[PDB]
Design a protein around this ligand. Sequence first.
Ligand SMILES: [Zn+2]
Ligand SMILES: [Zn+2]
Ligand SMILES: [Zn+2]
Ligand SMILES: [Zn+2]
Ligand SMILES: [Zn+2]
Lengths: 515, 7, 385, 181, 369
Amino acid sequence: SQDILDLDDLVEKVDFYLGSNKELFTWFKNFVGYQGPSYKRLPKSDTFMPCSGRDDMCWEVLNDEWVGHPVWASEDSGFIAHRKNQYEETLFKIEEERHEYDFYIESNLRTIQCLETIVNKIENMTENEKANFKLPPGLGHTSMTIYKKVIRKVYDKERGFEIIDALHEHPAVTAPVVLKRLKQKDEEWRRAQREWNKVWRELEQKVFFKSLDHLGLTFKQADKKLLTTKQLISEISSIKVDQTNKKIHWLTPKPKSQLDFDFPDKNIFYDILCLADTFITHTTAYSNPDKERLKDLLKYFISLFFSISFEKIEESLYSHKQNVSESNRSIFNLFANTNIYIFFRHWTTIYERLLEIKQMNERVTKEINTRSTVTFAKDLDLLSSQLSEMGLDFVGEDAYKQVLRLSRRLINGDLEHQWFEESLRQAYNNKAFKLYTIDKVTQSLVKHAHTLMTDAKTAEIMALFVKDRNASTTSAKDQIIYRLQVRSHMSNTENMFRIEFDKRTLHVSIQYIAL
Amino acid sequence: XXXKXXX
Amino acid sequence: VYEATPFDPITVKPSDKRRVAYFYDADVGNYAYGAGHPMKPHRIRMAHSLIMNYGLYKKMEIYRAKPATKQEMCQFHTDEYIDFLSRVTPDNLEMFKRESVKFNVGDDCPVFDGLYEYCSISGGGSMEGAARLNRGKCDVAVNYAGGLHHAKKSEASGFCYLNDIVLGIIELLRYHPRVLYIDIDVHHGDGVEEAFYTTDRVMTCSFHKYGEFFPGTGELRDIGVGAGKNYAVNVPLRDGIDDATYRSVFEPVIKKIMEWYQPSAVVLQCGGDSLSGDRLGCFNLSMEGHANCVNYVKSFGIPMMVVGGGGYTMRNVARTWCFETGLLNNVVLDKDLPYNEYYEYYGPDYKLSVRPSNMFNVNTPEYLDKVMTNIFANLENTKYA
Amino acid sequence: ISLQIPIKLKSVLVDDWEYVTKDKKICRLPADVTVEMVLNKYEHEVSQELESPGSQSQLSEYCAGLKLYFDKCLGNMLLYRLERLQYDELLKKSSKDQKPLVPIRIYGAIHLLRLISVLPELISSTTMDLQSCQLLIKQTEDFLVWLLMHVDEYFNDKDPNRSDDALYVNTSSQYEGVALG
Amino acid sequence: EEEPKELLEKDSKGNIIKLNEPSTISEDSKVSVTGLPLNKGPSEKIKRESLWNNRNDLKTFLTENMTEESNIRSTIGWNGDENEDFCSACNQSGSFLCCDTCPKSFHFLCLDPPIDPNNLPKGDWHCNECKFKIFINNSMATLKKIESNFIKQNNNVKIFAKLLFNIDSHNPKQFQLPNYIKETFPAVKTGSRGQYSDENDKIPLTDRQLFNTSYGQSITKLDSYNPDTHIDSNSGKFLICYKCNQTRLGSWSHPENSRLIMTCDYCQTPWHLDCVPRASFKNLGSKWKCPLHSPTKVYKKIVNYKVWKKQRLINKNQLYYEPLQKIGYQNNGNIQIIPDFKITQIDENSIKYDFFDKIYKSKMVQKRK
Ligand SMILES: [Zn+2]
Ligand SMILES: [Zn+2]
Ligand SMILES: [Zn+2]
Ligand SMILES: [Zn+2]
Ligand SMILES: [Zn+2]
């Protein structure tokens, strides 16, 4: 409107301003009728007498005017280095030492070959021609420097150049002696390389699968932070805030949920209960009177919520531990305080960390039960026997039966928390890092159940839930009475949730509530 | 600093 | 425009049997970039050792392209730059102090013995590999010693002293009206894109990270200038791209290029940097993720040149290069590994495989849906051949 | 010792110091309007309306002194580190061509303005008396007012990346490698 | 120490029948391996720390006999066609031609005339100051007899006499604006070695923030869901992106649903990296600017590449002369929204009317066509 900016730029910027609001920008376009960072330019300064072999097409078609440099699009300071685990750095160090040995041995071998051909020439030539023979620079072969480096590395660089000169000159001597010495160095470096290969292989076995464990090495510390009350409410509140923002700037009324936790597979609940029972039986913090109440509460909550026919757990767990010693019903709201929510969030965290293990277990049992050797690691014993000597390799049986058995071994402490990591590493590639914290997550789940009963008002809300679920028919008035009754047992400043459950699909949706 | 991470 | 689907196993195309001219000098590999440097020419030998120990020399021709000459490198670089490379050695770098600073040689692209030989070998293969593609003598030239796509007209940037790819495309251009340079190295083909930034006869399409990595360039809006406008494509990506996503962005993009900028030759930089486990990379790709790129480019039935550029794991690059070589020959390689001269190098299970790590894939949809949407809009201008 | 540069020339100098150092774009030399041309136009314009030989000779002496001090100082205190390679290349070109360097006939108005800005420090560095200091400052301020009347002739804003007829030319990586290396 | 015998060790008449190989000893035990010497196996320490507590199949020697020397393509050669460590002139580091006499040091391209490193005058080189010291003898009477004569011989430019005189006695000095001109613009600020910076340049990060950040920190806000703290720090609320109008963080059990968000350096408006198409957080270089700010360079084509730049911010010299408003009143682009570098003060309704009549009278002009 003052002839400093044109229509195109105005519309382009108003797009960033009046963007997602499609109607207003449509009006703007209709009324106003709207129908490279790098590569600076070198002007012409000097391109005269470069490229002594350039030709017509090559000269012109190429680009000389526009130039680009790393420092133009770096603001004089940039090019950060991608971070690497200490295991990746150990792999790099091993690789760099292997390369050192190979580069100094293979080049010595190339020079040995050239010198062997030369010496063969010398032997089949008579004394006179020996004394007159004279190799040219490069020894007649394609290279001109490799033999130079090889001799310099071996022969006292000053005397090394003295050699590289004598060799080019009279080779009736020198070439034989130089070949001998190169043979001695070759065998010595081969011995050393063979010795070093053991330690390099062992270090590689130790650190390899860890190196590829990026999201799993930070795990077990990110779980502690992000698996907490604050973070768990933060996620739900954020989804609610996004819905309320598409309420400010998009439809006002519609959302009636914010999470959609789903449970396609039963028979994982029993595994969670088994792990909880094992932990309970191991803990010294609780006393035996408390452990039984904890176990009963855990087995009872899920059977009440998902309607899992309590006896089913009774028989399934008993069968699981039997072989151990041989060696109108519809949507049903729950309502909750922060205490119930984090407990029922730990439960779904475990279930979600085991469902992936189930699917990958099908595929990965298929895989592992066909893990082929090759041919030459066995003759030379080049494979990692460590995970087999202590029987952590997943050969022989299922994957979603050895993960849980190993978890039990870990909770009881019979299994080191380090070897469990490796066992879950080179038995899943690296896809079960979320299981690295299975003792800690189950410990937290049992602690939250303990808080669930030995709190006071939380136990009362749980009792109210028990009363409501065991009902047969409920009305909107009954639901309202449920809401106010649960609220009565929480301060007006506490958060209330609306955990919902549908028996048909075994999917539960949270409905974070505003006072 | 204005180059590859290099050695 | 970006829809993600799982990654299917690589299957050779039965209707695209190709003659393959695989270039390898028994000397490239005896040169070292230093005592701690990432780039290591020994990778090329290890790729050969697998290629040879596997059965592939029966299905291909091994050529030792003669080293390039000064007047032959100068077709892209400058007289003084080449004159500098041909005379600088570790024992005389001092006398070239001004030139070393001038040409960016000494700090991260060091002066190692036989530097000139290495570039000549890399240059000769790329030039000669294009010659065979030119004189209808082969349908695929494999030079896993060039691919040095960072060297520019007069500077040795990022371990690349001589931009042999330009020499190759220059040779490919004395025959083929158009070329397409797909680069899939994690870094960006600054040297190659710069050389053909103004011309419409070469479309440099580079996939890379962009934002804080060595090249620095390659922003989505670097689409060429002058007549070469819209004939340069850049696909900036974030850390930890995986096969399912790379394949879902690489494939639709390359299809649209090949469909509208109908080329008569293809150069495919195959850099091992974009593979999980890199020493200077942040891409989470398996061999099959890398190889799916090579197969797709092959699928289009156009003469191709495959060069090996960046790779610093030297084992995850040798494997894929062998897995690529034994994939242009229409035979899917075995997952075991033959007894090579370098078998200790290979991991716990001495198998032809590079394992993706669990890194988080941050290249979310609705971003790759915008990068591809922009690229498609630009390519709409190349629609008219 | 308190020179009054108009804010417009301050903005021009601050564009210059933010180009040669941040954007690494040295000036286009030889310029379209060198120091000789600008000083000569200044003389031929102002002396045309001055009064008395005293003033008509003060102008003539001031321009001559400006030119002679520019020629001896530019190589010494008017180039950023980046421009000291352009300067060296011009010097070597002169030596080869056997034509002694004459910066007044090569460099443009921006470097003259640099000289103006640095002037007070140089005046303070001498034992030069108060009367001459007053006269110098008055003449320089008059000159700067004149340049203000003709700012959109010597310091127009043009894009080096969009026109070859721009006062600034982007450097090359191989240029600033030597210049700042 | 046996003498460094010249290996050939000719015996009778240069027949070289007998040799004498150099002693290796060195270049051996060199301990330059990235470990211990190359001829020795891994150390006992490395062993203890590191351990875990088919040649007939080699198809390699069969390579020379299937490699064909290849020579096609051009192949014709295409024949045809004590001393200071910083430069006293620019105050920076580099190679120096240190003075034998003076303690000052200069670059080779900072001297006057610039000196080529490979074409040094060699011998002994003096700086301008020491040359003047020996040319003047440091006494005042001779210096007077010299400088007054100089002034007399320069009568034509006597007005500039001493300025001309004093150049000879000064070493070369890099040009830098005196502070009395930079101060006019509070935004600008010098850099570490003269890198002349503005408000648009990001504060540099420290080595602690880059080289010490653990896995998941720094530029590493791309590797984990760990930086879920894209929640408004000051208020504890959620940083909402301006375009999608929501904050995405998913859960620790669904980190793939989180979308990166960044706050603009100039105005702290949050944006999704996927909404303003970007591939990384800046963290370096310049300060990020939303796509929601007004342009500074407004390059215009009507070629007529007429440039428009927003006048640099002036010291509180700054003037705001009040309008009488309504149409006209053509400011260049400078404005100070209100409820000789004169920042015009346009209030609110004037913009409305000015845009209204611009677009309307332009549409009527189109009608004229
Ligand atoms: Zn690379
Ligand atoms: Zn200096
Ligand atoms: Zn001195
Ligand atoms: Zn902003
Ligand atoms: Zn957004």
